[PDB]
Swiss-Prot record, chain A:
This is Inner kinetochore subunit CTF19. GO terms for cellular component: kinetochore; nucleus. Component of the kinetochore, a multiprotein complex that assembles on centromeric DNA and attaches chromosomes to spindle microtubules, mediating chromosome segregation and sister chromatid segregation during meiosis and mitosis. Component of the inner kinetochore COMA subcomplex, which connects centromere-associated proteins and the outer kinetochore. COMA interacts with other inner kinetochore proteins to form the inner kinetochore constitutive centromere-associated network (CCAN), which serves as a structural platform for outer kinetochore assembly. The gene is CTF19. The keyword Transmembrane helix does not apply. The keyword Coiled coil applies. Residues 35-197 are annotated as: D-RWD.
Swiss-Prot record, chain B:
It is found in: Nucleus; Chromosome, Centromere, Kinetochore. It comes from the Eukaryota. InterPro entries: CENP-O. Belongs to the CENP-O/MCM21 family. Residues 25-211 are annotated as: D-RWD. The D-RWD region contains a double-RWD domain which is involved in the interaction with other kinetochore proteins. This is Inner kinetochore subunit MCM21. One of its GO terms (cellular component) is kinetochore. Component of the kinetochore, a multiprotein complex that assembles on centromeric DNA and attaches chromosomes to spindle microtubules, mediating chromosome segregation and sister chromatid segregation during meiosis and mitosis. Component of the inner kinetochore COMA subcomplex, which connects centromere-associated proteins and the outer kinetochore. COMA interacts with other inner kinetochore proteins to form the inner kinetochore constitutive centromere-associated network (CCAN), which serves as a structural platform for outer kinetochore assembly. Component of the heterotetrameric kinetochore subcomplex COMA, which consists of AME1, CTF19, MCM21 and OKP1. The COMA subcomplex is part of a larger constitutive centromere-associated network (CCAN) (also known as central kinetochore CTF19 complex in yeast), which is composed of at least AME1, CHL4, CTF3, CTF19, IML3, MCM16, MCM21, MCM22, NKP1, NKP2 and OKP1. COMA binds the centromeric nucleosome-binding protein MIF2, and to the outer kinetochore MIND subcomplex. Pfam families: CENP-O. It comes from Kluyveromyces lactis (strain ATCC 8585 / CBS 2359 / DSM 70799 / NBRC 1267 / NRRL Y-1140 / WM37). Keywords: Cell cycle, Cell division, Centromere, Chromosome, Coiled coil, Kinetochore, Meiosis, Mitosis, Nucleus. Its main location: nucleus. The gene is MCM21.
Amino acid sequence: SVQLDDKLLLKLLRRNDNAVSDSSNPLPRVLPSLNIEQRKKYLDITLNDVTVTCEKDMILLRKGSFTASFRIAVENESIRSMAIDLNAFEVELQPIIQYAEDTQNVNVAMMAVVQFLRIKELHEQMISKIVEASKFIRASNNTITLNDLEVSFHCYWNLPSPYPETLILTNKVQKILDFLIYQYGIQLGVIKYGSTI
Amino acid sequence: KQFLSENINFSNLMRKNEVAGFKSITDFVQWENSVRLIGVSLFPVNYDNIEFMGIRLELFDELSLKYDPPFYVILKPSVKRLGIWELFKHNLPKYINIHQHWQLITKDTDTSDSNIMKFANLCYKDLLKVHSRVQFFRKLEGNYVNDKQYSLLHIDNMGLNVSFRLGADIIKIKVDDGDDEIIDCTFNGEKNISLLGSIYGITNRFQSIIM
Ligand SMILES: [Ca+2]
């Protein structure tokens, strides 16, 4: 039953009540309730698929059996020193965290480890959908094979921004696959590229 | 109960009855300020007869190291399509195409926690191409290159157009999203192909090479 001073959000819930009335007495006079219960259930479905936890001073981000540990130091009110440790994912993620830990830029670190796990789950369920949908077999996350042909799946970074884009390679030919993924789309194209060539 | 702050200021994350199932309201706000760091967040606006769903979009600025104020996009529980969300009040820059992203994802038909996470991540992404791209020009202030100082003169809202001085000569530039490519350059006023290549690698490493 706590009345929150948020004070941006309260200036917003008022504004567009007022900005649509610029079209010619719309003010709230009432403040929202706060209940930690729902607030948590929301922060849950935003992390969904991954847990955040804290053993001071470090704060762990974990999707099963993977741990990205961020130890952070703050001299009020500003961050100073950030440091990081991973497992098994050092290489795949390396380039973006070169940047992150090098600027001591925190959210770039996190949001990139989040979206890497998401591009990894996307590829893994993309490769499942391909293997059972045709004659293909699997080696690791990276690769699938049909006879003499090897198609790799994995992410690259445009170094500034934490959002990875996907890169589907193969032993040559490249021009051909790349275009059958664009026109016919990543699954139906990589199915088609396992017929012609 | 006011240990919760609107901005995600760094102190809340550190030092030292069940609330949320957690230990105490402090140890909840340590967890909440932790998660929120990712820059994207889901949080409830709760009223007695309704609950809106807000979307926290927060950038980390490295000049003074702190986050910029949270941006909110807010979603109303719908009517006439009964159990789904619809768009309500947004303060976001006018460069972010907010509505084209809503349709690209939900098609207005299915609004699902799964699909709404995909919705922010699209907005937030367009927000960091712009911010990260402006900020790269702020970070160079005071830095030399070729032992000539760089000061910045002017940059526009979203930073396609820029003017800096490099040690006594004025370079102007124009950029094209989302290539972050430099399409035009004016060196001391005359046309220049040298710096042209790209917004990052080429505007340090290629500034030394020819000019
Ligand atoms: Ca409803």
